[PDB]
Amino acid sequence: GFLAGKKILITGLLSNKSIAYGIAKAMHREGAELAFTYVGQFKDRVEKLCAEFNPAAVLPCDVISDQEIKDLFVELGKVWDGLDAIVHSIAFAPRDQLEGNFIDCVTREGFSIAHDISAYSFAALAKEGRSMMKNRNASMVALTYIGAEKAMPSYNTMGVAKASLEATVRYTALALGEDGIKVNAVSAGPIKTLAASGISNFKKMLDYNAMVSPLKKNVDIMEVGNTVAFLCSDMATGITGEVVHVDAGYHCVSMG
Amino acid sequence: GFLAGKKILITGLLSNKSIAYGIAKAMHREGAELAFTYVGQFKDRVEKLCAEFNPAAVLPCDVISDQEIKDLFVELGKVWDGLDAIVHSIAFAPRDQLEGNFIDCVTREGFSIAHDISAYSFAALAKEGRSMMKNRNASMVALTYIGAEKAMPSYNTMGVAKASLEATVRYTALALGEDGIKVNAVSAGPIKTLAASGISNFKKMLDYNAMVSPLKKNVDIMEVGNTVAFLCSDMATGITGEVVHVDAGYHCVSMG
Amino acid sequence: GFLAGKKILITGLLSNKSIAYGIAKAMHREGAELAFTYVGQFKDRVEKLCAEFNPAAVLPCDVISDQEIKDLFVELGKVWDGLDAIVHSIAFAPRDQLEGNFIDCVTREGFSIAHDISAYSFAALAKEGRSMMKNRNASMVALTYIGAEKAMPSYNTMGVAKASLEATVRYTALALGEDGIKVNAVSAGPIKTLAASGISNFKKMLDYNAMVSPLKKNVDIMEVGNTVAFLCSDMATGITGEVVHVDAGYHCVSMG
Amino acid sequence: GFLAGKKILITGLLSNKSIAYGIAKAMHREGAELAFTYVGQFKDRVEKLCAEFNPAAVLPCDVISDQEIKDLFVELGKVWDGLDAIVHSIAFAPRDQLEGNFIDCVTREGFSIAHDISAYSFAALAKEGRSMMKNRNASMVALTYIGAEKAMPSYNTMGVAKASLEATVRYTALALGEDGIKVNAVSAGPIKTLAASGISNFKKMLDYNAMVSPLKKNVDIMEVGNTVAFLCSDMATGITGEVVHVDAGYHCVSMG
Ligand SMILES: NC(=O)c1ccc[n+]([C@@H]2O[C@H](COP(=O)([O-])OP(=O)(O)OC[C@H]3O[C@@H](n4cnc5c(N)ncnc54)[C@H](O)[C@@H]3O)[C@@H](O)[C@H]2O)c1
Ligand SMILES: NC(=O)c1ccc[n+]([C@@H]2O[C@H](COP(=O)([O-])OP(=O)(O)OC[C@H]3O[C@@H](n4cnc5c(N)ncnc54)[C@H](O)[C@@H]3O)[C@@H](O)[C@H]2O)c1
Ligand SMILES: NC(=O)c1ccc[n+]([C@@H]2O[C@H](COP(=O)([O-])OP(=O)(O)OC[C@H]3O[C@@H](n4cnc5c(N)ncnc54)[C@H](O)[C@@H]3O)[C@@H](O)[C@H]2O)c1
């Protein structure tokens, strides 16, 4: 496997529909040694779910908290000497930020929170994980959406938070490059996950991608997972600060 | 004047050198009726600066506060029947967010504050000004910088907040379009302003720009101001969600 | 007028529906001294049409021919000492390049011809006009379409030619910057012109822009013309290598 | 191997240092069955180079000729029941198009030739290969360069042709998508190849890249080859119309 022996932390695994689940399946297939995080109460749920990946550790991490993130790496460091990659597959904005007219709905705190969790958390993981990642062709990958690049209905302040995220990925790539850490993002097309039901427009978005996309289909978590996997491999060491669209080609067309 | 009669609110006027000053000069030349905001204790400084423009109002507004933004437009509603444009020329991030390695310097709070004042404040002005701007070919312009698009040394968290601001400009353009309101940004090249002091490598950027850009020069506040004035005129009613680079062409080249 | 006394050459004027016609109206309004080109047989047609703009010259120029382009500037130079701007508002691809599946329809020669006329002609005009434009804040503007940036049905090899054009604009901006010549493009939304009937998809494209665009409308030749006018003014001397979308905001959104 | 069984045609193999050589090494390692084309008198040189790959066929194809491209696929149809991928790793422009000021150097013919071989030839391969690639998760990859996106010294007409090639990649992706064929490009950083000799400022670009890019290094043909191999694999079936930068992050930064 092209990830054989690599030590990789996966965030955001919630159900077997999660993009993180596809990433896990892909990386496990390729020989990676995998660890996982969960938020507070989903402990036993995620614990059962990720067992099938022979995890080196399953640890709590609500990225809201500087403490939990710091402790995540303290505990992870009791299990692993160093770390090969961090996979960031997590976002959040209050529900009222994801419906209706953007200007009607947006609020100062919702904006703040969407950004705190969906964008800042990526650089926070980088900050704490850096020491374990130093000097080993380490990698980071974040999940984003085309809502960052173009305005669209519903996605609203999450769209704005994704743009912050993509920029954070670029600045993170610049900052950590000297340590041989590559930092990239996968821009995934619409996939029916738990988080997706939180988007007003989702059924429409999903249907629309299939019709308009060049490949005339929706993507799945294995296409996404496989791409994230590659981006944590030695084959991808020339790639950094990049956004790769895994969206059946939706990003390259206009009209349809 | 191609702004004759138009009622425009200008934020960010701090000194003789502010970009907002160039904007003000340009719009006053073009027949605009102007209002200005100030923060903190700069009431006298700003009144003195903007006196030559015969402003209708010089009002307090620290965009950290929702109430002040709300009261700004209530007071404005007392001198003006309606608003033609809002010029957003305001940004802030704590000094420790603008020096050294991005991952070293980044903090949750500094991230939050940068986004809150540099980006959220644009949508906040849009939210409270919206009713006065409805249905008169109204306009909004924000000031951004190429650090939103590309990572660069030192700009760090502001770079990320600027990416957030540009996405906010797009979603705002989408949200306000049905009201005939166009929403755009001007991406200015480095100009020597008071804020530029907070950029550790600023003299670097300025000299680099002049040497590398096609027009082999630095831009000035009138170049930026004229462009902002244009983007508030009836000539630009076909343009929204756009970012216009006023940077002597720096944006279009690679190497020099 | 903000173009008062400026000497500007306009190409592509064919009917009073032409984008070039809007550009002419706008620049004449702003005090510009205007000259025009035509292709071979449209001589008397264009001659009648542009009379209303008090043209300094109306000259033949089929950009297919290196000879006619060279002679255009020889004759123009008998009338004007120097030249302030060139407006390129011309494109062509064989009809069979603009219908159906791109791969089915595209041909080596059609590709060549689309590029020769729609892209190369811009740099050819720059090459010959340069000497008259030297050292006077001169300008060039080309018309493009979003078909360059994104693949779309029908537009096909014209889309590919527009991408070449936009790149030619950037390389031209780099090359001529040292002479103080600024070089930009306006990316216009769909407008019902003569050339438009040559596009299979046009009615659909037109209708689709109105529904999806933030400003919920189609643009007109005066919005486009006014923007081109501004881009040939002293107000725009900080702008070069830029593409400005005048498309009611279509470019910034996804879905609708 | 993640290309096991896949039948892939590789163009552009000229030497030990060609990018096509890195691509070939990577795909042979991953289980691909390979074929190669050559131009002119390099039949013996290429057969000798690609012998270790146990190619199914080493065939003549100068992409200036439609007939040769047509006959290529007829001959290929004699060894293979179907084609899984085409690697386009080929460009050309006359030397006088790659030195000095772009406007000084550009000619109609040099423009035409650059586009014809560097860009049109990609769609031409797509046209004639299409029937063998139908409905097998087939793939196309072209090699491009950041000179398509930004203007830079010397690259000149090739820069423009590369912009044309990237648009062709998008329209081809749109056209071939219904056939399950994904179409992408790899944007490689400067690598020391035979062609690089024709770039007057190449040692400039190479040293600049290593100093300025986040990973503080130059890319190599295996980094590019691995990525191209990935883009021909079943793992990448969610990706089309994409451009992936394999440039040590150069694309994402500004200043250094
Ligand atoms: N589903 C899609 O169509 C799609 C498309 C593009 C991008 N993405 C992105 O992919 C990622 C995965 O989302 P998903 O769609 O698989 O949904 P999901 O519901 O499976 O995953 C959402 C994850 O975010 C985690 N999360 C939320 N707040 C957190 C916090 N404070 N700390 C730690 N974890 C937190 C949740 O536990 C959950 O595991 C997200 O970044 C999402 O924005 C999803
Ligand atoms: N100077 C440059 O090179 C340059 C380049 C690109 C973009 N910009 C942007 O242009 C804008 C104007 O900046 P400038 O360079 O003219 O500097 P400046 O220092 O003259 O103006 C900055 C303004 O931001 C205002 N501000 C800061 N915090 C505020 C708050 N909380 N509430 C209300 N106002 C607040 C300040 O009062 C000040 O007037 C900024 O958005 C800046 O990021 C500047
Ligand atoms: N109509 C639209 O929706 C639209 C949208 C975006 C961009 N554009 C671009 O704007 C420009 C103006 O086109 P238009 O739509 O106003 O159509 P139009 O039919 O009025 O103009 C087409 C012009 O190109 C000229 N032309 C063609 N071949 C020529 C040659 N070999 N030499 C000299 N002139 C030649 C024709 O004479 C004509 O004047 C074109 O570049 C077009 O691609 C048009």
Ligand SMILES: NC(=O)c1ccc[n+]([C@@H]2O[C@H](COP(=O)([O-])OP(=O)(O)OC[C@H]3O[C@@H](n4cnc5c(N)ncnc54)[C@H](O)[C@@H]3O)[C@@H](O)[C@H]2O)c1
């Ligand atoms: N070397 C770099 O730094 C770099 C960077 C970015 C992109 N690229 C691109 O990668 C590709 C491979 O180039 P390379 O750098 O490995 O150089 P190379 O000289 O090894 O390969 C160039 C190939 O183009 C082929 N070619 C030229 N004209 C042809 C024609 N008419 N018909 C068929 N084949 C023809 C040549 O035979 C040769 O094998 C090119 O598209 C190039 O533009 C190279």
Ligand SMILES: Oc1cc(Cl)ccc1Oc1ccc(Cl)cc1Cl
């Ligand atoms: O970013 C997404 C994009 C799409 Cl199309 C579907 C789901 C996405 O992911 C989320 C959306 C909203 C919230 Cl609150 C949390 C997450 Cl993880």
Ligand SMILES: Oc1cc(Cl)ccc1Oc1ccc(Cl)cc1Cl
């Ligand atoms: O965005 C800017 C970009 C440049 Cl090149 C120069 C000044 C800028 O403006 C700021 C920079 C830092 C802070 Cl704290 C506040 C402001 Cl207004």
Ligand SMILES: Oc1cc(Cl)ccc1Oc1ccc(Cl)cc1Cl
């Ligand atoms: O580029 C265009 C885009 C649109 Cl939506 C409409 C018209 C356009 O202009 C042309 C289209 C085809 C040919 Cl043959 C010539 C020209 Cl001038």
Ligand SMILES: Oc1cc(Cl)ccc1Oc1ccc(Cl)cc1Cl
């Ligand atoms: O595109 C390239 C970019 C770089 Cl940095 C180096 C080599 C490249 O490839 C070429 C450059 C010029 C010619 Cl004539 C032919 C080819 Cl294949």
